[PDB]
Enzyme design. Structure first.
Site: not given
Ligand code: HG
Ligand code: HG
Ligand code: HG
Ligand code: HG
Ligand code: HG
Length: 264
Positions: A60-61, A152, A222
């Site tokens: 997604f930009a 992570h 997240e």
């Protein structure tokens, strides 16, 4: 139906020699944790190529993030699933601003301006990453599986109490201090199309419940991904090789390769 592998010559696996003595390479539910030195890529490439595997890569930009697309795609071309069919899906508010990047054979790019079933007929696996990143080394079929999350980089050595899970019971993302396997990063997950759609449907419904209830989980997407992956164990977990931040974290001995990274 899976056709036979051809004759291949490679080093015999050594039953009395561990892959790694420094890291955990299998989860307690027997999913592999993917570190350099665990896999023979020639074997895996053969298995996936024989299935004519297509991988979808979604980014997604929006707004200023369109500026990251050129480096992201050029480096994907150098390192991501090379030899396999790839379909890039770039979701953007600025279709005319997407850079014209040259793609290898077998690789295609769709620009979608901001449905779902399009993926089920076009690709076998979906990989979902943040666009302000670049590939620095091989990211290949070793990641592919029904459902994967990635460790992570700030939390892989942490105890579960230090994990930044959502901690208020009022949120659908809540995880208490005595639960949790790992802290997965929102920026790099994937799996079969069907499993990725299950996950995003689940997180989308949980987030609407939280919104109706006046609460927003501490790390948003997240936090909900971590809840999902706690209750639906991933079939592979990727090591932090797969989303590292060298500026913040350097290059520890435990990382043999730095494969994909945040742009500084
Ligand atoms: Hg090994
Ligand atoms: Hg996705
Ligand atoms: Hg979720
Ligand atoms: Hg969501
Ligand atoms: Hg999610």
């Amino acid at each position: 139906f899976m056709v036979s592998l051809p004759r291949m010559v490679y080093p015999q696996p050594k039953v009395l020699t561990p892959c790694r003595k420094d890291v955990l390479v299998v989860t307690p539910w027997l999913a592999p944790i993917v570190w350099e030195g665990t896999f023979n890529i020639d074997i895996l490439n053969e298995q996936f190529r024989l299935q004519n595997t297509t991988i979808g890569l979604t980014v997604f930009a929006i707004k200023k993030y369109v500026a990251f697309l050129k480096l992201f795609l050029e480096t994907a071309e150098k390192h991501f699933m090379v030899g396999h069919r790839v379909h890039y899906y770039v979701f953007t508010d600025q279709p005319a601003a997407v850079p014209r990047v040259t793609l290898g054979t077998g690789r295609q790019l769709s620009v979608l301006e901001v449905c779902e079933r399009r993926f089920l007929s076009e690709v076998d696996y979906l990989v979902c990453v943040d666009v302000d990143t670049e590939f620095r080394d091989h990211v290949g079929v070793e990641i592919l599986t029904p459902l994967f999350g990635t460790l992570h980089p700030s939390f892989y050595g942490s105890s579960r109490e230090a994990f930044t899970y959502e901690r208020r019971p009022q949120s659908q993302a809540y995880i208490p201090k005595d639960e949790g396997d790992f802290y997965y990063m929102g920026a790099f997950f994937g799996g079969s199309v069907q499993e990725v759609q299950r996950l995003t449907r689940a997180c989308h419904q949980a987030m609407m419940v939280d919104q109706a209830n006046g609460i927003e989980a501490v790390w948003h997407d997240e936090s909900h991904l971590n809840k999902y992956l706690l209750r639906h164990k991933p079939t592979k977990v990727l090591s932090p090789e797969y989303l590292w931040d060298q500026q913040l974290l350097g290059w520890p001995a435990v990382l043999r390769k730095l494969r994909f990274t945040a742009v500084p």
